[PDB]
Amino acid sequence: TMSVLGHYNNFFFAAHLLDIAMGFKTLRTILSSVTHNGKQLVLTVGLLAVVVYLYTVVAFNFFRKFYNKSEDGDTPDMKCDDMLTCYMFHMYVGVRAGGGIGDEIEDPAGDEYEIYRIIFDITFFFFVIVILLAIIQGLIIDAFG
Amino acid sequence: AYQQKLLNYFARNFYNMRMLALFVAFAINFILLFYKVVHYVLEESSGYMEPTLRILAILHTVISFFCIIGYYCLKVPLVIFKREKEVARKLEFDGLYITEQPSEDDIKGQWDRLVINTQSFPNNYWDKFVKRKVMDKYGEFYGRDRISELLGSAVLNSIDVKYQMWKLGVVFTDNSFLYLAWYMTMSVLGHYNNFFFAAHLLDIAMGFKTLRTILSSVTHNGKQLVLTVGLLAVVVYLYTVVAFNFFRKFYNKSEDGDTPDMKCDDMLTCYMFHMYVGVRAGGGIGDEIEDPAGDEYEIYRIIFDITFFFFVIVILLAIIQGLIIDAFGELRDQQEQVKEDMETKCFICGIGNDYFDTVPHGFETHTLQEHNLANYLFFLMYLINKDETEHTGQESYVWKMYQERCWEFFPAGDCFRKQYE
Amino acid sequence: ELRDQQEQVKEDMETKCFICGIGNDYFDTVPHGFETHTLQEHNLANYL
Amino acid sequence: MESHKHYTQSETEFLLSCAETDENETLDYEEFVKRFHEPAKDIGFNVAVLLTNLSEHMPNDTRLQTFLELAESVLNYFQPFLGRIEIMGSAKRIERVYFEISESSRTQWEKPQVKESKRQFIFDVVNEGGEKEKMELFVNFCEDTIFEMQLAAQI
Numbered sequence: 001t002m003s004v005l006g007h008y009n010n011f012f013f014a015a016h017l018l019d020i021a022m023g024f025k026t027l028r029t030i031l032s033s034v035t036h037n038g039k040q041l042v043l044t045v046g047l048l049a050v051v052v053y054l055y056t057v058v059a060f061n062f063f064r065k066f067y068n069k070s071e072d073g074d075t076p077d078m079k080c081d082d083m084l085t086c087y088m089f090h091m092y093v094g095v096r097a098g099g100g101i102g103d104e105i106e107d108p109a110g111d112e113y114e115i116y117r118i119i120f121d122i123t124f125f126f127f128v129i130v131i132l133l134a135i136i137q138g139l140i141i142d143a144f145g
Numbered sequence: 146a147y148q149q150k151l152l153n154y155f156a157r158n159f160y161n162m163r164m165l166a167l168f169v170a171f172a173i174n175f176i177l178l179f180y181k182v183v184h185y186v187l188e189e190s191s192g193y194m195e196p197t198l199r200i201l202a203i204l205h206t207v208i209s210f211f212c213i214i215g216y217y218c219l220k221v222p223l224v225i226f227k228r229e230k231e232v233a234r235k236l237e238f239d240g241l242y243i244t245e246q247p248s249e250d251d252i253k254g255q256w257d258r259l260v261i262n263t264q265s266f267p268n269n270y271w272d273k274f275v276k277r278k279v280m281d282k283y284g285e286f287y288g289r290d291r292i293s294e295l296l297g298s299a300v301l302n303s304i305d306v307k308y309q310m311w312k313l314g315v316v317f318t319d320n321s322f323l324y325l326a327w328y329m330t331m332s333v334l335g336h337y338n339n340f341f342f343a344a345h346l347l348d349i350a351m352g353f354k355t356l357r358t359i360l361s362s363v364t365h366n367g368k369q370l371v372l373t374v375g376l377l378a379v380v381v382y383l384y385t386v387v388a389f390n391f392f393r394k395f396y397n398k399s400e401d402g403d404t405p406d407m408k409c410d411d412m413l414t415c416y417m418f419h420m421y422v423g424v425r426a427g428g429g430i431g432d433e434i435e436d437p438a439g440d441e442y443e444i445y446r447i448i449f450d451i452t453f454f455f456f457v458i459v460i461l462l463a464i465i466q467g468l469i470i471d472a473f474g475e476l477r478d479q480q481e482q483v484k485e486d487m488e489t490k491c492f493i494c495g496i497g498n499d500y501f502d503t504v505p506h507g508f509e510t511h512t513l514q515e516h517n518l519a520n521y522l523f524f525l526m527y528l529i530n531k532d533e534t535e536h537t538g539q540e541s542y543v544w545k546m547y548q549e550r551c552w553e554f555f556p557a558g559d560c561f562r563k564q565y566e
Numbered sequence: 567e568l569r570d571q572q573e574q575v576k577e578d579m580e581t582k583c584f585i586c587g588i589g590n591d592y593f594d595t596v597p598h599g600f601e602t603h604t605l606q607e608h609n610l611a612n613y614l
Numbered sequence: 615m616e617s618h619k620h621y622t623q624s625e626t627e628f629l630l631s632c633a634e635t636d637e638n639e640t641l642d643y644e645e646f647v648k649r650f651h652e653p654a655k656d657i658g659f660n661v662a663v664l665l666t667n668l669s670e671h672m673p674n675d676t677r678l679q680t681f682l683e684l685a686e687s688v689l690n691y692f693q694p695f696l697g698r699i700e701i702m703g704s705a706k707r708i709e710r711v712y713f714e715i716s717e718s719s720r721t722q723w724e725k726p727q728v729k730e731s732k733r734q735f736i737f738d739v740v741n742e743g744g745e746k747e748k749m750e751l752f753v754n755f756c757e758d759t760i761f762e763m764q765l766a767a768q769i
């Protein structure tokens with residue numbers, strides 16, 4: 001039917017190439033090494049997303065004005081008092097962030113709240129780096145084993 | 146009849162509503178994401194947001210109340226069955242407070258000194274025998290003084306209260322009870338403040354048990370893990386010690402030095418800055434540094450800190466991935482040896498999957514019949530069912546063995562075709 | 567490897583005393599004979 | 615009963631004349647058998663244990679095998695209901711002992727929390743434990759399990 005949809009639309013026609021996943025059987029062992037434990041894997045990553053979800057719950061309720069995509073505040077300050085798009089932005093900045101959830105922070109001026117937010121979020125990016133990585137490498141290399 | 150009826154009901158209808166408390170927590174988190182800053186709640190086309198919000202919030206607190214009632218109905222008697230069994234046999238086989246007098250560890254145990262004064266003690270091991278037996282066996286030779294050392298809406302203040310007060314003190318020693326009770330108090334704090342109300346969701350950590358294996362894979366080695374990470378923090382601490390004492394002016398958050406230069410001659414906030422970047426830097430402790438202008442100190446600082454970020458990348462990562470993936474491997478080890486030893490050696494057998502395949506499908510039947518794990522249990526029921534008069538001399542014999550708890554009736558596991566074949 | 571070391575330690579302690587070096591096999595045909603075998607038959611510090 | 619086909623019709627009518635033939639001709643299930651048949655169930659159970667341990671003691675006896683297999687529906691009935699265990703109770707051969715399992719106690723065992731704590735206890739023992747405190751703690755788990763089934767029975 002993908003081949004048929006190419007006769008209707010020859011642009012998703014090139015999307016056939018999931019057949020090599022049942023193609024050369026070493027690649028099928030690769031995908032099986034993915035998927036044979038993949039029940040635990042996927043349910044684990046969903047649990048991980050719930051962890052990050054609850055983290056962004058925790059990483060809002062005192063920290064409500066600070067972090068902005070804005071041009072210093074001249075452009076309107078992009079801290080999210082919506083809960084949902086805070087999750088979206090928080091999750092996104094914990095997924096494709098790099099240096100945890102500290103990159104998009106006000107540098108530490110030194111409020112009593114600010115020692116808290118600095119140590120808070122550097123340890124919580126650290127705990128991300130603990131949990132989600134340990135999921136990935138442990139689950140996959142043990143699947144290979 | 147209301148109370149006892151609901152006791153029997155929360156007995157018979159408990160884990161269903163435990164899963165319902167799970168689902169209601171999910172329903173909490175689905176909606177607890179529509180806030181807008183004075184704080185209020187946004188409205189969408191479902192015109193019942195705040196009513197059913199408040200309803201299901203206080204109702205989930207009510208569900209927590211329901212499950213703590215059902216848990217008081219739940220394995221609390223098995224808890225005290227273990228406890229009273231333990232204490233009564235450490236009076237029976239031991240007599241701990243008679244002469245032995247255990248140390249200050251486990252005043253869980255030493256807590257049970259004065260419950261032996263309470264004459265209602267061995268209820269939930271059905272074993273009122275133990276009191277007068279210890280009195281006869283241990284108490285006579287050490288004296289009638291020791292016998293006195295151990296003997297000595299309407300109905301509210303006319304019963305054995307200190308027995309029950311002792312019992313509740315034992316109840317508070319529990320971990321799962323404290324877990325669900327703290328969960329309940331979170332539900333209470335939601336009635337006081339329905340904003341940390343959504344923080345219930347650590348209960349899924351003892352929820353679906355695969356997640357509990359995940360958290361156990363965290364925590365079973367977690368002693369070494371946490372002490373290691375503390376050691377790591379000390380390593381970084383001492384590194385920032387080393388990474389100050391020549392390098393004292395260089396690295397600044399400042400706007401080139403027009404804004405005041407942010408290098409830290411405090412030792413403490415130098416640690417804070419260093420540690421912070423290390424745990425949220427990415428590239429290392431080189432990102433926030435001057436350009437390698439080429440001082441003799443500067444070759445030193447460049448090579449210094451690029452290798453020391455490198456050594457961070459060695460040590461802290463190797464901690465993380467080695468500890469966690471080896472924890473996963475240990476989790477594998479446990480259950481694979483389980484599935485080994487189940488397929489080889491029954492506990493009453495303990496010989497192997499070897500003799501009973503020389504009997505072809507004799508290991509199948511050997512498992513199912515020869516040691517048939519719960520049937521020896523069912524015989525223990527049968528002993529507890531029958532009476533020693535009613536017993537056979539074989540039954541009363543092994544019962545007398547059970548009075549000794551000497552287990553020798555149980556063989557090497559050599560079965561009926563092992564005596565002859 | 568650090569795991570390997572101590573797991574083989576806890577293997578060979580539960581099987582073969584150094585003066586014994588036979589296994590956890592004959593001395594369970596004597597039921598709780600391996601317990602006593604460890605504690606008495608080779609009783610490590612007593613040869614010391 | 616003839617729709618069930620399970621009885622010879624002579625014995626169906628032996629049961630019919632046996633039952634009540636009363637109030638028109640009607641009959642109760644329980645009050646005709648139960649108060650006597652369940653004791654007789656225990657009796658023929660003991661017979662089944664008796665012939666069973668005749669076989670188990672003394673095998674390979676086509677006389678006994680024939681006498682056994684003619685009785686066989688009883689054996690098939692009580693096959694969960696029999697208790698059967700093995701020991702060495704000072705007779706110093708390897709000594710099997712057969713007895714009664716209350717099936718109500720297995721409906722108590724039918725509780726899956728028993729099964730889960732049971733498998734957990736399996737994991738506990740295979741995880742670690744002294745081989746001499748092994749069956750000791752096993753029996754202790756059994757004792758807790760017995761009391762647990764008392765608890766589940768009184769609900």
Ligand SMILES: [Zn+2]
Binds near residue numbers: 491557559
């Ligand atoms: Zn055996």
Ligand SMILES: [Zn+2]
Binds near residue numbers: 583585586588607608
């Ligand atoms: Zn030896």
